[PDB]
From a paper:
TASL, a recently identified innate immune adaptor protein for endolysosomal TLR7/8/9 signaling, is recruited by the lysosomal proton-coupled amino-acid transporter SLC15A4, and then activates IRF5, which in turn triggers the transcription of type I interferons and cytokines. Solute carrier family 15 member 4 (SLC15A4, also known as PHT1) is one of four members of the SLC15 family, which belongs to the proton-coupled amino-acid/oligopeptide transporter (POT) family and the major facilitator superfamily (MFS). The architecture of SLC15A4 lacks a bulky soluble domain and the TM domain contains 12 TMs that mimic the canonical major facilitator superfamily (MFS) fold, with TM1 to TM6 forming the N-terminal bundle and TM7 to TM12 forming the C-terminal bundle. Here, we report three cryo-electron microscopy (cryo-EM) structures of human SLC15A4 in the apo monomeric and dimeric state and as a TASL-bound complex.
Although the structure of monomeric SLC15A4 was too difficult to resolve due to the low molecular weight, we successfully resolved the structure of dimeric SLC15A4 in the apo state at an overall resolution of 2.93 Å. The SLC15A4 forms a homodimer with overall dimensions of approximately 70 Å in height and 110 Å in width. The TM domain of each protomer adopts an MFS fold and exhibits an outward-facing conformation, toward the lysosomal lumen. In addition, we observed four cholesterol molecule densities within the dimer interface of SLC15A4, which was confirmed by Liquid Chromatography with tandem mass spectrometry (LC-MS-MS) analysis. The SLC15A4 dimer interface was mainly composed of the TM9 and TM12 from the opposing protomer, and was stabilized by a number of interactions including the π–π interaction via F417–F417’, the hydrogen bonds interactions via N428-N428’, as well as substantial hydrophobic interactions. In addition, we found that cholesterol also plays a role in maintaining the dimerization process, for example by engaging polar interactions with K425 of TM9. Sequence alignment showed that the key residues in forming the SLC15A4 dimer interface, such as F417 and N428, and the cholesterol-engaging residue K425 are not conserved in human SLC15 family proteins, indicating that the ability of SLC15A4 to dimerize and engage cholesterol may be unique in SLC15 family. Our FRET data are consistent with our cryo-EM structure, and strongly support the notion that the SLC15A4 dimers observed in the structure, can occur also in vivo. Structural comparison between SLC15A4 in the apo state and TASL-bound state revealed that TM9 and TM12, the two TM helices playing an essential role in forming the SLC15A4 dimer interface, bent towards the dimer interface.
Residue numbers in the entry:
A (entry chain B), B (entry chain A): 18 to 135, 150 to 267, 301 to 356, 361 to 520, 525 to 558
């Protein structure tokens, strides 16, 4: 019946198999370049060409990441009011490549003198490159996600759900490629060759759109709507009556989806802190060697999470697209976010248990292992015991990560698409920054949880339990908000 | 509108304030007597009048508890087919008082010779008394709960929801009275006076119904329905067609509510194990003294849980009857069970954290404290640190315990009321027994979690984490079952 019809829709892609693979490949290459920059920025800045202090490099990376979140709302508005999505993404990719071209030249010893030969050694060029890269990334992220789902939007709302699966899969495949191959070359072979590859990736990602301009679905720009709902918004949030035709409906949609985005700040707060502290714990756990180029990169550890995601996304798809559809289970995009939050809390609890075990074991004996150029003191507890953690968050990223994008896409006005995604990725950055502040809070002398690269004297288990409690409170609040919204 | 109407219904009781207080008082007295028997049965059996071994007394108490669960389905059937609820409860209370009269006589030194003067010293009389008490308790429990809600059933389904709140409140008040006063006298003053009081409670509970026979709502017995849906059930589970008039509907209801009861076995499995191991942990924690009669009873520790429940039930009622009704939040009786399971899992995790802290602290120093007539080795960690546990389960008993009874009452055929409650209380016993088996499982030499009254050498934290995992899996399964049922 209806189920049969929906399963038949799941039979999507179909005609448009080109228009999609192009977007998937473009996002893969863009993510590969982004992770190539982000993985080893601090090592590059604190090295031979640049004599920046560790604090300066950390602040530079923090500003670069913050720019990629702050520029998203403005990148989305530019792609809706003044330009189309295709042209905006093309301009953003051109700017991203321009910012890309700076780092290989600085890495090269011959061309470094031309740029900055004659505190910070080469602050202007590096800052300009980082600003350009951040603006390009912010404009691409806020615009590629709705542009890709535009091709599959005609076949109802299950084709856009299948597309957002292989979009996340391509993102994670690009992350694996960048953090595995490029991050290895950047630290073992040379920085020139390690930074030339992501530039070539950006160059190839630009060619794909030019080749695929004949198969994409475009929408004419419309800034009149933005003017109507920004300039004369203060004149009113509802009850337009005879004045205005249906723009009051999209004003209602905006003011109704803002609270859902606001209630998701603690989710990102916990999620980014889990990204950081999980790697912190992995560094202090027994890591086996691979050979008899040395000192495997620390970025490889992050790969672990994404390594799960790939193996889950096909499987899940099959074992979720029939199984959960013919039974009418979990159809909405908000209950899936709730399930993701539940599994985030479970992962936090598992991490706390493992950290308590590690802190109990470390009092007996400790070994030294080198990662990069620094030796960490680790207990004699195998790294693979951290596998149960990464499953639970991985399942979370199966549910909460994709469903968040689906909700941001579907529950948004047609005119302001790619601008609601801008707010989504901006509130993600706000959550990341408040999470950094939370980490700074528990590090004070009054609490002393994170008073000290060795964490054998820091109670990471209490931090994990606090994150679990925050995630539980967020789960309850989000359940209430989702019920009220529906 | 509709909300207003429902809030007005909440304005219940109203006319029937007598018919209810009578049921509440009867259940209070019955629970006081039951907890008077259960609290100190082992101490009585292993003492001066009786020279039973500890294993024999434990087996006797286990059989007594198992009888109270096994007799529930048959007690409910007797109250529906052959008798009315009022007459069945009166007969059960008479039998309960008859079984009650045995223990004071055995405790008294003069009358002990008349009963058993001339292995187990007085097995026949004690076994007969325990059998009579168990049958009486089983028949009362399966019949008092639907009889009490019968008075308030006319004013829609919010009066039966308010009644089931003050019913649980009266149960917990009776538990506090029995475990605080009676359990104190049974161990400090004398067993004769400590067992005379619950007999007087049973006697008073019998008088209340005789006084309230003029204000109760009764239903004529109907065994023809039981014959129709038992004897010729094998002839068919649906599609009756011209044969039968609407009994196929109640057959459908039975076969549709059986899976929900089956999926609740792990809930009771975890809940009873939490009842036991929480007291086990409380015994090994620093307990302050009260005076300068000595050796406060161990049963007082159980009081802790119920001590919360009282303070929650009024408050909750108010802060849930307006607040959660005008907002249309959590109206069904199964989502409340799901919330209770969530809080059970959270309590298990908190208990595991506290147990890990206690096991870390015990390695430094240990103190000795006497409870009853046995000294426990306890860490120097305050007992009140166990408060966060008992809140989380207490909230659970606010949601899962009451809503389970509401679902058992509402989702049941009109003819088989008090027989579905029999199955409810029987599956509760099945869950209790499988929980006892689970505790016996983790005590084997292969696992060794509970290899040994001192638990300083037993990993209770791993047991708590296993209970939390079981509760999470039960939460997921129950969510799926509840969605399919609705
Ligand atoms: C006892 C004190 C702590 C009050 C507890 C309130 C919390 C525990 C309970 C009470 C009200 C509940 C919410 C009421 C609103 C809904 C909508 C319901 O359809 C799905 C669950 C959800 C999201 C509930 C989540 C849990 C909840 C927030
Ligand atoms: C979703 C939430 C409720 C999960 C519960 C996690 C929190 C509330 C629980 C888990 C472990 C619990 C702790 C268990 C052990 C200790 C150590 C003791 O020295 C003080 C109490 C304290 C600190 C408890 C505080 C509350 C606690 C931290
Ligand atoms: C609802 C469920 C999933 C909650 C998760 C609880 C379980 C699955 C988690 C919580 C703590 C985790 C443990 C953390 C620490 C250890 C000790 C180590 O020597 C073996 C792995 C092991 C044993 C992990 C096994 C999985 C684990 C027990
Ligand atoms: C990835 C693997 C572990 C599959 C995971 C399945 C579990 C995690 C998910 C998938 C399907 C989900 C259930 C689908 C059915 C429903 C009905 C929905 O309206 C409420 C939630 C509930 C009860 C979901 C609970 C969580 C659930 C059981
Ligand atoms: C660990 O490092 C410390 C500091 O250099 C050193 O003294 C100690 O011997 C090292 N242990 C091992 C096993 O290398
Ligand atoms: C605890 O009990 C043991 C065994 O009787 C005893 O030897 C020890 O001294 C006791 N400790 C205290 C503080 O009483």
């Amino acid at each position: 019946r209806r189920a049969a019809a929906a399963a038949a829709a799941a039979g999507a892609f179909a005609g448009r198999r080109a228009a999609c693979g192009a977007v998937l490949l473009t996002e893969l290459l863009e993510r590969a370049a982004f992770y190539g920059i982000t993985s080893n920025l601090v090592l590059f800045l604190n090295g031979a060409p640049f004599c920046w202090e560790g604090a300066q490099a950390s602040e530079a990376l923090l500003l670069f990441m913050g720019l990629t979140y702050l520029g998203s709302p403005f990148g989305g508005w530019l792609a809706d009011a003044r330009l189309g999505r295709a042209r905006a993404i093309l301009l953003s990719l051109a700017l991203y490549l321009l910012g890309m071209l700076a780092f290989p030249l600085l890495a090269a010893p011959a061309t470094r003198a031309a740029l900055c030969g004659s505190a910070r050694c080469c602050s202007p060029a590096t800052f300009a490159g980082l600003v350009l890269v951040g603006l390009g990334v912010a404009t691409v992220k806020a615009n590629i996600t709705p542009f890709g789902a535009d091709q599959v939007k005609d076949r109802g709302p299950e084709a856009t759900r299948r597309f957002f699966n292989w979009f996340y899969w391509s993102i994670n495949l690009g992350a694996i490629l960048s953090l595995g191959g490029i991050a290895y070359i950047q630290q073992n072979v040379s920085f020139v060759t390690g930074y030339a590859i992501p530039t070539v990736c950006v160059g190839l990602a630009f060619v794909v759109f030019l080749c695929g301009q004949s198969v994409f679905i475009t929408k004419p720009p419309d800034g009149s709507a933005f003017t109507d709902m920004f300039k004369i918004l203060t004149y009113s949030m509802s009850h337009g009556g005879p004045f205005t035709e249906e723009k009051v409906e999209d004003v209602k949609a905006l003011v109704k989806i803002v609270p859902v985005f606001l209630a998701l700040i603690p989710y990102w707060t916990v999620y980014f802190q889990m990204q950081t502290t999980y790697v912190l714990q992995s560094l202090h756990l027994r890591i086996p060697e691979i050979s008899n180029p040395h000192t495997l990169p620390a970025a490889w550890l992050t790969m672990f999470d994404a390594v799960l995601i790939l193996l889950l996304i096909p499987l899940k798809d099959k074992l979720v697209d029939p199984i959960l559809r013919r039974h009418g289970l979990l159809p909405s995009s908000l209950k899936r976010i709730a399930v993701g939050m539940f599994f985030v809390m479970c992962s936090a609890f598992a991490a706390g248990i493992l950290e308590s075990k590690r802190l109990n074991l470390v009092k007996e004996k400790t070994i030294n292992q080198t990662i990069g150029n620094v030796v960490y003191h680790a207990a004699d507890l195998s790294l693979w015991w951290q596998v149960p953690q990464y499953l639970l968050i991985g399942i979370s990223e199966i549910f909460a990560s994709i469903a968040g994008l689906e909700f941001a896409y579907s529950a948004a006005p047609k005119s302001m698409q790619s601008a609601i995604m801008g707010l989504f990725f901006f509130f993600s950055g706000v959550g990341s920054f408040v999470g950094s502040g939370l980490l700074a809070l528990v590090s004070i002398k009054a609490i002393g949880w994170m008073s000290s690269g060795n964490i054998n004297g820091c109670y990471l288990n209490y931090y994990f339990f606090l994150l679990a409690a925050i995630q539980g409170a967020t789960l309850l609040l989000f359940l209430i908000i989702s019920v009220k919204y529906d």
